[PDB]
Each structure stands twice: as C-alpha cells, then as structure tokens.
C-alpha cells in the first residue's frame, strides 16, 4: 500500500523529491520544514514536472508557466492553474518517509 521514498535526513527543509512509480504516473514529495507532503508530480495545467519547480513554504511553483499549488491542500495558489492537484498521504515511520500508492480520499 505504501512506498519507500527516502530518509527524512536525505531531504533538507524546503526541498523536493520526485518519486518514479513504474507502471504509473510520478509523484512529488515536498519537505516543508519538518512535515512531508506528496502530490501528483505532473502540473494539472500541462505536462510539467513539479519536482523541477520551486518550493516557497507550502506552495510549489511550476517551472513551465509559474502556476502554483499548495502542496498540503493541492488547491491552486497562482494562475494559470485552476484544476486542483492530486494529493497523496505521507507518513514518517522510523526516520524513513513513506507515500501511499493511491491518492487520499
């Protein structure tokens, strides 16, 4: 049900990490200080990889057009984005970070 991403130690606060999932679309895990979050890697406004964007607090900015999303809620934060992002549950069990195989309900 869950996937092993990395150790909380490997990620510095404010960094991003792309999670490739063979057979399915890629995910993006963001470390906002001490809390980890995960959403679809693909920007809902196109075909850009959010993991290649810029993270400012709990907001991720797409590299293609500057659209943005709240990595916690998945909701659009900056135009041109209008379609919410698919958010996936994350959990840190014993220093390591895990991400649910399917997006939360």
């Amino acid at each position: 049900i869950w996937l092993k991403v990395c150790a909380a130690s490997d990620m510095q606060p404010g960094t991003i990490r792309r999670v490739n999932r063979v057979g399915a679309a890629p995910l993006a895990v963001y470390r906002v200080g001490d809390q980890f979050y995960a959403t679809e890697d693909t920007c809902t406004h196109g075909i850009a990889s959010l993991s290649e964007g810029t993270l400012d607090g709990d907001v991720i900015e797409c590299p293609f057009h500057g659209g943005a999303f709240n990595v916690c809620t998945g909701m659009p934060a900056s135009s041109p984005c209008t379609v919410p992002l698919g958010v996936f549950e994350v959990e840190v069990k014993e220093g390591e970070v895990y991400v649910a195989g399917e997006k939360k309900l």
Binding site: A25, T42, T44, S78, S79, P80, V83
Partner: protein, 388 residues
C-alpha cells in the same frame, strides 16, 4: 478592476467603477441576437465583453461555449467540426468538448491523454425570451433574466420585434446618448416626427422639482436597478428654440404624445414609454462587444391578444415602425455616438466634460451603475485571469 489610468479614477470619485468599466459589466445577461438567427446544428460566432463565443442549438435548446480551444488558443470556429450531436471537436488537435458542460471528453489525436475528463472549456448560460437570445456573461449559476430587463419587456401579452447591428463606439457613449433628455434635438427632422405626427419638443428641460423628475430604482422586487427621467410628468417641453431672444427653430406640434418617461437599467438597456407610437414601447440595449464597439439591440413592444394582431403588428413593423422609427428616427443616434468617441477615447473626456442641468439624470445613472453593477470585466478575464 484597473482598466483606466489610476490618476483619472481617483478624480471621478462619484462613479469611478463606471468609468473603469470600459469592457462592460460582468455577471449580467445580454441580448446578442434573435432566436430566428440561430438554427439547429449551425454554430454561430460572436464577441461579447471582449470574449469570443460560439452558440449552437441542439434539440431546440441553445448552448454557449467560449470560442477558444484550451490547448493552443485557436478559435474552434476557424473550422467547425461537430462530429457528434452533443460535442464539438477542435480542428487542430481534435480536443473534443461537450456543449452542455464544456468538459474535455475526448481527444482524437491521443485517446489516452491524461487531460481527458480533467479540463473544462468555459460555458455561459443562454436563455431565449421574446424571440431574443440572452447570454449570461458571468460566473456561477445565473440570476433570473428579469433582473437585467426593463419593466414590462417580459409581459406575456407583449409582442417583441426588432433589429440588431454593430455600432462603432463604446457601449457607455450609446447609453448616455439614449438616456439623454436634451439630445432629442438631433431628431427634430426625423421622418417619424412629421410622418407619424408626433408631439416632440426640441428638448425636455428640467422642471422645478429635480428630486421628482429623477427616480432611482433600487427597490424593485425582481432586483432591477435603474433610473427614471420623468420628463413628461416633471420636465418642461421646450418647443421654441431661441437665440438672442429670436425664435430660430420650433419643435414638432403634432398630436401624438410619446416619451412620457424614459428609464435606463443595468447592465445597459433603455426603455422609452410610450414610443414610437402612444400604444407601443421601445426597449434597446447597448451591448459591449469590445472597448470600441457595441451591439445596438433594438426592440419594440406592443400588446397583442391574438395572432391576427401579432401579424398586423408584424406587418406594421416591417412597413412602418422598423423603417420609420428604428431606422428613420434612431439612425441619427448612431453617428451621434460615433461623434463622442474621440473625446472619451483616451479616458480624459470623463474628466473634461462640461455638463449642464439636463445631465442630472445621466449622473444618477453613473452612480447607480457604479454601486449596483455585478462586476467589472477586465482584459484579464479575456486572456485568462491572473493572480499570484
């Protein structure tokens, strides 16, 4: 919403929103054509409030989609491809949208695309009333149509007939030409005056009780918002024009009493009662197309209890009213509007204009529109809303 130099908006404290609304007011209904002009399965194009739209009739019902593909921004209308009764396929990469909800349901160039079912093309509510096509250029479920129509236009017995065309001037110049009490001076030679034996003064000057002549309506049960200029009941009919004391021109001393009351209503529709005949009414819209143009949507209403009357009226309209009134009388309004373009084109006319007493009603309208409009259309609404 920032369409005009801020230095100018800061100057017109009484009605800055109105001055800023160069593209018109969003979230209001607007007539754009007649039902008879749009046939089953034949998509028609038009621009409203700067936005390119497509209207189609499916199973008798009208649907409106923004005429701009979500992909590369081309107009679908360049090459219409309606492959199934309920959809339209962009001619470029075949992104396919449903007329009913605008959802991107298929993409022929890539049936596996992750965009399918995850994007939505903008749709706008469309309603037909009195043989007129109304489009709600706004967001969210629409308010009732009556809110944006003048009193009586929707009366069950009211038979509506008219014409529409594109005029080259901002919609506001049209509005303020129409709701103007003293501008009828330009209609002193119209064939309608003589040919219909009308009683028409050169101008309706302000009587003695101002607050009685102008009536602001913001208590209409249907939510209508407008202003009345009670010229016939409170204004003064000026029939003898003088210069230096000498009479140089006279109004028309006919027997038909018309234009007892005139009223302007958001989003921008004028009602003249009674006109062009004592047993008729005129309802005309000045619909924003872009900042330089508007649709001059003219309608004439006349009660009709049966077809025989509707036909008789239908004949009088084609043979007299339309030719003698809608055109013979109003044609001079067209170039009049055009004549004000230069003064207001740079937005500076809104500061330099020198108004006089009869403009009191226009001022009331500017304030009412500023306070009660449902939104300012901006160029960003046209290109795509922007925000950080």
């Amino acid at each position: 919403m920032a369409n005009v130099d801020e230095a100018i908006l800061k100057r017109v404290k009484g009605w800055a929103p109105y001055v800023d609304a160069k593209l018109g007011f969003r979230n209001h209904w607007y007539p754009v054509m007649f039902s008879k002009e749009i046939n089953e399965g034949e998509p028609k194009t038009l621009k409203l409030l700067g936005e390119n739209l497509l209207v189609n009739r499916i199973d008798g019902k009208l649907y409106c989609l923004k005429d701009r593909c979500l992909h590369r921004g081309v107009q679908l209308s360049v090459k219409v491809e309606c492959k199934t009764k309920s959809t339209i396929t962009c001619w470029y990469h075949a992104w396919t949208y449903r007329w009913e909800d605008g959802v991107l349901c298929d993409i022929l160039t890539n049936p596996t695309s992750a965009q399918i079912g995850r994007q939505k093309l903008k749709t706008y509510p469309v309603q037909e009333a009195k043989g007129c096509v109304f489009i709600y250029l706004g967001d969210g479920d629409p308010p009732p149509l009556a809110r944006d129509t003048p009193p009586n236009f929707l009366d069950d017995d009211m038979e509506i007939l008219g014409k529409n065309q594109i005029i080259k001037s901002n919609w506001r110049l049209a509005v303020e030409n129409g709701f103007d009490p003293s501008h009828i001076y330009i209609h002193k030679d119209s064939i309608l005056v003589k040919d219909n034996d009308l009683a028409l003064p050169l101008g309706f000057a302000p009587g003695g009780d101002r607050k009685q002549q102008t009536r602001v309506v913001d208590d209409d049960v249907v939510g209508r918002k407008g202003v009345y200029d009670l010229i016939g009941e409170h204004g003064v009919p000026v029939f003898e024009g003088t210069i230096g004391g000498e009479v140089v021109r006279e109004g028309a001393y006919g027997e038909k009493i018309v234009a007892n009351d005139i009223s302007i209503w958001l989003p921008g529709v004028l009602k003249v009662n009674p006109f062009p005949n004592p047993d008729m009414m005129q309802f005309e819209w000045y619909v924003p197309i872009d900042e330089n143009t508007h649709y001059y949507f003219q309608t004439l209403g006349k009660p009709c209890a049966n077809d025989e009357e509707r036909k008789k009226y239908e004949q009088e309209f084609e043979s007299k009213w339309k030719p003698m009134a809608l055109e013979g009388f109003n044609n001079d309004d067209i170039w009049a509007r055009e004549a004000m373009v230069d003064f207001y084109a740079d937005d500076k006319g809104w500061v330099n204009e020198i108004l006089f007493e009869s403009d009191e009603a226009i001022v009331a309208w500017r304030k009412l529109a500023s306070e009660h409009n449902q939104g300012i259309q901006t160029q960003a609404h046209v290109s795509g809303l922007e925000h950080h």
